[PDB]
Symmetry: C5
Subunit: 338 residues, 5 copies
């Protein structure tokens, strides 16, 4: 039989096939089996609180109307134009902010049918998915971003999604993220939805994203360490040089504040204390205490008498040991806790 006539008899004019009717429409729900290949993964934004993926979405279900005997071939690879002629699930991504198909240079779609009427339908999609983030431990945080595959119009009695048994989520070889590490273990689960329009099938996959710490050592933690260490050189400067020691004190405090708000600029305006806030707060405390230290040194030595000059000198010599020692103790606590 010629292919043109076969397609005509199976799903075309002479077929009497109606794509508005599901497989076994008087019978049990259509069991769809999903799996995704993750071609790319990125644009993980804290501010907009979302991420982007390019995937191949594979769906599998049985349509006894598409079973064939005319060829001995176990499967037939069909032209994607025939997808419009057949019934297919109405899967949508429940937490999708933006989604699109790919049409260059032709529709990036795949249709394959088997002897027994099974269908394989793969379609390429770019999705932007919402991923609410918990920034309490930033930048030592780990996020959990999800992806929900749901039916819009079919209730649980007509259509049921299920992750494939073997390898439901594949990831492209050598795929990396610059800011995160994508953990090998993906959690699969059900998000079965109950709306006032009914009960709807929904399956979910959770990716775990561990933020890479290296960037923050170099661009956040070390340069704050500078400003704190810089603040301490005041303690080796002559107590008579007020303009010099105040200059150091101010400029370290101010550098430390612009450092602090510089890092807050890349994040959303959450109303809870993050780990980076604690660090910047304590660093700023140490830098501010050092200025108060000189204010004390300057003030106790007003009268130029030896007894008072000696008392001021003791404040400096204690400071040279205690400030670094205390800051070292703080680092032990901070790093151990997280």
């Amino acid at each position: 039989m010629s292919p043109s006539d076969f397609l005509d008899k199976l799903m075309g004019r002479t077929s009497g096939y109606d794509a508005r009717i599901r497989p076994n429409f008087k019978g049990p729900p259509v069991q769809v089996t999903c799996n995704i290949f993750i071609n790319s993964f990125g644009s993980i934004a804290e501010t907009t609180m979302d991420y982007r993926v390019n995937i191949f979405l594979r769906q599998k279900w049985n349509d006894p109307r598409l079973a064939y005997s005319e060829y001995p071939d176990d499967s037939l690879d069909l032209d994607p134009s025939m997808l419009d002629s057949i019934w297919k699930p109405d899967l949508f991504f429940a937490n999708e902010k933006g989604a699109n198909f790919h049409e260059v240079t032709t529709d990036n779609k795949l249709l394959r049918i088997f002897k027994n009427g099974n269908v394989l339908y793969s379609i390429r999609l770019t999705l932007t998915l919402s991923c609410p983030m918990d920034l309490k431990n930033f930048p030592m945080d780990v996020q959990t971003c999800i992806m929900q595959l749901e039916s819009f119009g079919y209730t649980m009695n007509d259509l049921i999604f299920e992750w494939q048994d073997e390898a439901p989520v594949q990831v492209a070889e050598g795929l990396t993220l610059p800011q995160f590490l994508l953990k090998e273990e993906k959690d699969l689960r059900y998000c079965t939805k109950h709306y006032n329009t009914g009960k709807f099938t929904c399956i979910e996959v959770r990716f775990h994203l561990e933020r890479q710490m290296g960037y923050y050592l170099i661009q956040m933690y070390i340069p704050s360490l500078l400003i704190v260490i810089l603040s301490w050189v005041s303690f080796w400067i002559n107590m008579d040089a007020a303009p010099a020691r105040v200059a150091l004190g101010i400029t370290t405090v101010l550098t430390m504040t612009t450092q602090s708000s510089g890092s807050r600029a890349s994040l959303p305006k959450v109303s809870y204390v993050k780990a980076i806030d604690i660090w910047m707060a304590v660093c700023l405390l140490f830098v501010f205490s050092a200025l108060l230290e000189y204010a004390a040194v300057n003030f106790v030595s007003r009268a130029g008498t030896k007894v008072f000059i000696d008392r001021a000198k003791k404040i400096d010599t204690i400071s040279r040991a205690c400030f670094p020692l205390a800051f070292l103790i703080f680092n032990i606590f901070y790093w151990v806790i997280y």
Copy 2:
């Protein structure tokens, strides 16, 4: 009866149904009943003065042409392709800046008809809606953002919208906003429009958004408290150290101004006094007064005589008590008022 023939007889070729004609077109207006499920709520922008939602819009109306007896089923879940074949309301969002449908992986639409000809039509939409904001109490403000559902072509004598009686506005479980708290109570009302083209049905829903205060304590109010407290250390510095005390005075004023304009950068250019303006103004007054305080101290002590040196010293000792005390009193007033 086969589904294909039933759809053909009800709204297809052999039906004689005309979707250009409303239900009961010679009779009273079509009573439509709306309800929304809010799948997401965010992108609340002060600068552009708008917000974004992803909703399922449900509409319900009766079309006696679609009543059926051929099946005992109380309702039939139909393929959304049939939405093109039936009449439906021309609801539009009157305050929408941008709107779009969702088409991945198929049109995110739902059609359900009942024995008596009732229709349920749910469609998924991303909307950007305008929300004019009153920033007088920012950042302790609370906004009221609306959403108007209106008919474009049908006047009140052909078509009438109405919110559902039970649960017209549902919100997705666990939906949060990072900057605001969305209040449980939504106001419903009428926006019935009168244009030169006629009188048009319009129903409205108001969401109340209370801005979360926590972010502003950490990134606005506390760091301004620093600069004010920092300004006071000048009062414990030796009056002879002019370059040190002027250095403190300048750099606190300038830090305070860049702090002030830093916060104004995230807002629209409104021409009224906001709460944040008052705070920054008073903080800047306290920081500026402290510099003037030294200018006074320096100036009254020009001649190096004890009577004048004593007078200058009194200005400092009074300042150490009064500046903080006055600033504390201001905080009591400011916080109590808002």
Copy 3:
């Protein structure tokens, strides 16, 4: 019984009608007189940098098509399904100064079709337009702009099609519509922009909106903080002439604050090559702040030798400065504000 709607639409503009939408009303006769009016649903995004603004409007067009006249119903008008707009002739109005334009299609096409007994048509369509508005920033931020909107025919010359603003209420504005930076003046000017191209002479009607910039924002974020830096600069005059590092510190940091203030405000504007009002203010403020530093340089220099005659001469420069600097700055403010907030 009366005629069914389906058959009436079929006989009027459908299969059996013989209507051709490629042919205008009275095509051998005089031009089609179209009557336009707009409802302004929103008005905003007034950008100086990109030099444009945005509106959401309902565009109403009215014209007579004797082919669409009917007697089959006693109704004075019939409200028709917008799908029928494709079946009828309609003007090819476009916005001549539009940078971006779009229709609205959620949840259906935001369109309106209404025909009357005598064949008159009312066609309303909802549009978001971004329109170009060349701006004269010479008096910024006390400026007032005039932004236009041109409705023009693309393909029909003046002998086939003519646009005209409605007589009664051609431009309506939504109740309670405000702009945050501007005041939209009640009076809109209507005019003709009749175009002559090498392809012919084309109808074009125009509406001008007047936008008065609100001054309040600039008092708080531009004029008052510059007043600070000038007043701050004066405290140097009460500081001891012996404290050079203190008085130079004040002088530098006020000049530098004043320059970053000045270029901070220029960041929100296009790169025009003419002097604006804000430039004059920042220039004079910077002059007063710079003169104060030069004042100390003079004080410091004349008092080099520590002798009373020279120390006294330097002290006189300071005491004169305490009066003259503020007095001169006050006089400047009188002149500046009188000039711009009069002419």
Copy 4:
């Protein structure tokens, strides 16, 4: 003859016209004559290295199939829907980054045919065109931005573009650019392309854009003149006041560097020396030399003896004359050269 029948006989059902076949397809190439009206011209970006225009593109060619005698009218203005029914050139813009048609409120198109079969086809287009820029003389530069009209599928033996003889490029009355002056003289030329697919017609127009200098006097050259003049006040300050004279020297150098990199922020990251780089370099040299001048003054006067104090004083008095004099000479050279 009724218009409906005339269009039917000329290019419709009964016409036998095939728009897949060019005019005189066995004969010589179709001679197309182009002209543009420039409705707007702007968005001239240095960073992205492109510009934007809104044009009416007019094309003229003869199609003997569309010649008519049925009406005495010299030309017929046709409904643009008929453009789909006729053959037309496949002109594209070879250096276009983005292009779009205008469809509000109807397609912004014009079709006019003449007795002899001539066609006038005008279409409105927004184009973003690439314009590689030579920034060597910025901001006294003058750019040359082009616009190439090319055939995609027709080789030189089937289709030939040519600029109109009389007034090929019109510009809207009163059209201005804020940063540039668009010169009256446009160059027209040929870009005839040779690809491995063949030889393709291409005509080009070059616009000359002279950058307006006024903005840069006020926001770049004058404020740099300030910092240089400010640097000189150090020379009238007492040599004993080191913290004051070093303060001036540092802050002028640093102001001068942030000024310099502030202006580089608006440009692409080209790897050649621009005119603005030379100016900022020399200004920074004069400001840096002034600091070195004090370092010298301070250093030669270490021992507080008259002979060395006098030698230091001479360095200052020479500096007061030579620094401005040298800077004036530099300005003469710099401005004369460009």
Copy 5:
């Protein structure tokens, strides 16, 4: 001769019986497609988003015996692109494409040409944004390798095979330049043959090599950092008694050096490895910070105003005037030799 309208009708139209849902030789071996690209433009090379943009003409060549003709003596026929919808064509897609679009102004930017023997030439104009993962370890003396993968979506290796053309598979428009990079003449061609759970799919790849131009960074990064280091040294010629002056210099050079450093990091992605620019900024900041510590030492050892201690402090300064520049010069030798040799 036969009219064009009838010829197109008999070849691929109503009366032809041609089915574009069926590939050439569908029971036979795979369709051999031969690709070549003309690069009309190349740019928008972004480090942050980690991608680049091209405007290309994509040419595909394959044989369709159904489209062979004898009715005309012409070796090839240039056909109207509307006929592309009527014929079978490969389903080539760009595997590493983030965004892609066709060009439709003023008509579809497409080309169809068929030959006597049924060969087809199909050229289509495309703007592509392609992902190019970057290794910034040597930034800004880095060289990137950006790829472009042409793949079949639906046809497995037994039905469809892509292959680069033998002669001149990748042409580049005359005078095409990039402002930040140099595009190297040699393009590598290779296979990316994909194995998915849906099957084995043809894929061919081209690699462009992009050498970052160094000139910009000398002027806007390396020289201005050289300033701050040289500026830091003037402290050594300032009087040791002038603490506020020498501390002022020390602070402001350190702080200028830190804002310089983080200014340059703003244009890059947030990678968690050490780049070459990080080492430079680190060492510059070390030299500027050491100079401040140098004065702290000078100030501290000279506390008691006695000659023996004043002399010791003075020696720290005189050694510093020679050693600081000398050491910084030695560092430059090492740094430049390592990265540029």
